[PDB]
Design a protein around this nucleic acid. Structure first.
Ligand SMILES: O=C(Cc1ccc(C(F)(F)F)cc1C(F)(F)F)N(CC#Cc1cccnn1)c1ccccc1
Ligand SMILES: Nc1nc2c(ncn2[C@H]2CC[C@@H](COP(=O)(O)OP(=O)(O)OP(=O)(O)O)O2)c(=O)[nH]1
Ligand SMILES: [Mg+2]
Length: 644
DNA sequence: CGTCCAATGACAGC
DNA sequence: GCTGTCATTG
């Protein structure tokens, strides 16, 4: 009962036996064998990997029980030349693709990355039910550290730890078979992983059943990984010319601000050095000392802090947005455009999806700069960095967002009749909040003030104190306390929900979302008042924000299911590359924004996808409050117009 | 000693 | 070599 590797591509008879057994397995694990070219004498043939030089996919290991790993060589020549590589890739695709009535699940560590490699390198598109142990580890503890192969074996299969004795890459987040840096062969690494991943998943599936989270794992979380896989293969269009255009006009404003600021100070100073800013603003002037955004917003009434704040916003866009975007862009010759390919991250505390390298979610909102014209000398020009994100030639960006998703969930749980009343009016909650605060007409509220009222809204709802609220509103703490107390007197059901949530969390030790995902907050019983209250606010926010993330995932999964139904074309822009012209059809998931789904849709399918997206988002889950969706389309992420 | 939540990511002065 | 702070987004 020791580790046995059966090289199935060595004998035609042994291969056909392997294909015979594999085709009747309803559960198996696979691990891609990736290896780096470390010596020309030992260099193995295989399929090259995009973005990696000297790294190839040499094979693939399959395990369906015990410590027997079946290694499937993807090299150009086998021990039996009658079994050509083309014959092997045929059987490989035949077994990794299922029929309608057939039911079969494949267990893969780091499924999204493996799905992309098989498609872009080996030309294999998986058509099975997917299970990833990394996702199962996250469902049991969303605040856990990102799982490694070593930690999974340490916690769910500890007897097989000596198998990972010499391989230090098992203690890395990357898969053992994908980490070609190890001096071990990809054949041994993939075979080891196949055995550890298959048996560990049976233990994880048992725990998920006992936690009543296996349905969420199979019907929501894993299909959401498949959707993000298509997103990572699609990427988001990027227009270097537009981004450079903004970099030029933004740098012109910075030059104008610097000149205008040097006149106000009587000399030249460096905006980077806070010492030079501190000497001017305080030692050279009459401003109350004790350069922070909070400090400079207080001192915003001579015009120098305002000019310093603007200089630091624009500089942040150039240095921390323009620079990474221009770096991570690459050419897609199959679409004739430049695209940015970010990486999805679903191991979050509440279940939200963020992205990395680069995090296109953090691309700045539209902001105005004033530049001298022939008349105004301060003419407003909008700087929309999202305008640089464009669809393929002949398509449009489709954005569909939930209208106050978290508030509707909060109404669903608190049953606060005043909140249900506010949502049913159809008026913007945040403009009304700003309309009473500033005593202005609602139609006059600008986005800056509306954003300020938005943070005042969710802040007060999620436990903000009077001191911070007074800092936000520029009023005294005692005056801000009236606004909080007035909120608690108006919306009593919300407060009753907050009280009930904290009480149950203190007893249960956790809080649950609508789908049943548990987040464990042991600080709910902490003695430290700060750490205790932070846990109390986490308990209330996780239920609402996490349930909002559940609804968006279900809608994404439901949308993509409908899209593949109508359009027999390529699932993703990676299926066009991995399979090698043909016109683009359908809509392509490009970005998720917590409450918004971004889609790159071809013109002839804009109406059809829009109907699909709106209907599926509105019927994701059934709530006591209706889920309202607004669909926008436009030639860019920054030129979205309302679509009926 | 720090009281809206979630997130990525560049720096710093411990 | 960093934990913390602080830009930005939701
Ligand atoms: O009630 C809201 C706002 C509000 C409305 C709706 C919601 C909802 F629907 F999302 F639940 C939440 C809020 C709040 F921000 F407080 F959380 N006040 C309360 C008040 C008042 C007041 C006092 C003297 C004179 N005039 N007016 C608010 C709080 C801070 C700034 C401005 C107004
Ligand atoms: N706790 C907290 N949650 C926030 C904050 N900003 C946003 N969120 C959460 C609540 C709703 C969700 C989506 O944010 P949006 O910016 O889309 O808010 P929105 O109400 O949809 O605004 P809009 O209708 O203008 O899109 O993110 C904040 O400042 N604090
Ligand atoms: Mg929104």
């Amino acid at each position: 009962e020791s580790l046995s590797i059966i090289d199935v591509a060595s004998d035609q008879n042994l291969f056909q036996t392997f294909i015979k057994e594999w085709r009747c397995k309803k559960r198996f694990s696979i691990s891609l064998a990736c290896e780096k070219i470390r010596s020309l004498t030992s260099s193995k043939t295989g399929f090259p990997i995009k973005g990696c030089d000297d790294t190839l996919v040499v094979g693939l290991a399959v395990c369906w029980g015990g410590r027997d790993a079946y290694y499937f060589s993807l090299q150009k020549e086998s021990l039996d030349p009658s079994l050509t590589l083309k014959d092997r890739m045929w059987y490989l695709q035949s077994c990794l693709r299922k029929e309608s009535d057939k039911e079969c699940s494949v267990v893969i560590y780091d499924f999204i990355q493996s799905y992309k490699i098989l498609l872009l390198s080996c030309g294999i598109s998986l058509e099975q039910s997917y299970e990833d142990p990394k996702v199962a580890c996250w469902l049991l503890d969303p605040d856990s550290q990102e799982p490694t192969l070593h930690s999974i074996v340490t916690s769910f299969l500890p007897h097989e730890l000596p198998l990972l004795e010499g391989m230090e890459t098992s203690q890395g987040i990357q898969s053992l078979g994908l980490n070609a840096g190890s001096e071990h062969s990809g054949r041994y690494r993939a075979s080891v992983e196949s055995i550890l991943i298959f048996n560990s998943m049976n233990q994880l599936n048992s725990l998920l059943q006992k936690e009543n989270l296996q349905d969420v794992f199979r019907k929501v979380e894993m299909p959401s990984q498949y959707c993000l896989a298509l997103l990572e293969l699609n990427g988001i269009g990027f227009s270097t010319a537009e981004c450079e255009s903004q970099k030029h006009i933004m740098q012109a404003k910075l030059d104008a601000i610097e000149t205008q600021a040097y006149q106000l100070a009587g000399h030249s100073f460096s905006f980077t050095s806070s010492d030079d800013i501190a000497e001017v603003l305080f030692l050279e002037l009459k401003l109350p000392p004790n350069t922070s955004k909070d400090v400079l917003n207080k001192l915003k009434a001579h015009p120098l802090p305002g000019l310093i704040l603007e200089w630091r916003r624009i500089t942040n866009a150039i240095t921390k947005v323009v620079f990474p975007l221009q770096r991570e862009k690459c050419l897609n010759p199959f679409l004739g455009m430049e695209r940015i390919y970010p990486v999805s991250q679903s191991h979050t505390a509440t279940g939200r999806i963020t992205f990395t390298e680069p995090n296109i979610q953090n691309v700045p909102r539209d902001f105005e700069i004033k530049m001298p014209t022939l008349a105004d000398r301060g003419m407003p020009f909008s700087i929309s960095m999202r305008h640089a994100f464009v669809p393929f030639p002949g398509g449009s960006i489709l954005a569909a967002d939930y209208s106050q998703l978290e508030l509707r969930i909060l109404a669903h749980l608190s049953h606060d009749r005043r909140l249900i009343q506010v949502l049913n009016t159809g008026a913007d909650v945040f403009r009304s909040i700003a309309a009473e605060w500033k005593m202005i007409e609602p139609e006059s509220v600008g986005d800056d003030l509306r954003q300020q009222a938005k943070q005042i809204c969710y802040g007060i709802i999620y436990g903000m104190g009077a001191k911070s609220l007074g800092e936000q509103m520029g009023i005294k703490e005692n005056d801000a306390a009236c606004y909080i107390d007035s909120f608690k007197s108006r919306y009593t059901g919300i407060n009753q929900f907050m009280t009930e949530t904290v009480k149950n969390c203190k007893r249960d030790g956790f809080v649950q979302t609508i789908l049943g995902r548990r987040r464990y907050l042991p600080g709910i019983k902490d003695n430290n008042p700060y750490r205790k209250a932070h846990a109390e606010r986490q308990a209330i926010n996780t239920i609402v924000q996490g349930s909002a993330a559940d609804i968006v995932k279900i809608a994404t999964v439901n949308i993509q299911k409908q899209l593949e139904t109508f359009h027999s074309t390529f699932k993703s822009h990676g299926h066009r590359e991995g399979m090698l012209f043909c016109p683009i059809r359908g809509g392509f998931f490009i970005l998720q924004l917590h409450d918004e789904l971004l889609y790159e849709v071809a013109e002839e399918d804009v109406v059809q996808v829009a109907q699909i997206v709106k209907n599926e988002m509105e019927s994701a889950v059934k709530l006591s409050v209706k889920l309202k969706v607004k669909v926008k389309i436009g030639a860019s992420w920054g030129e979205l117009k309302d679509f009926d």
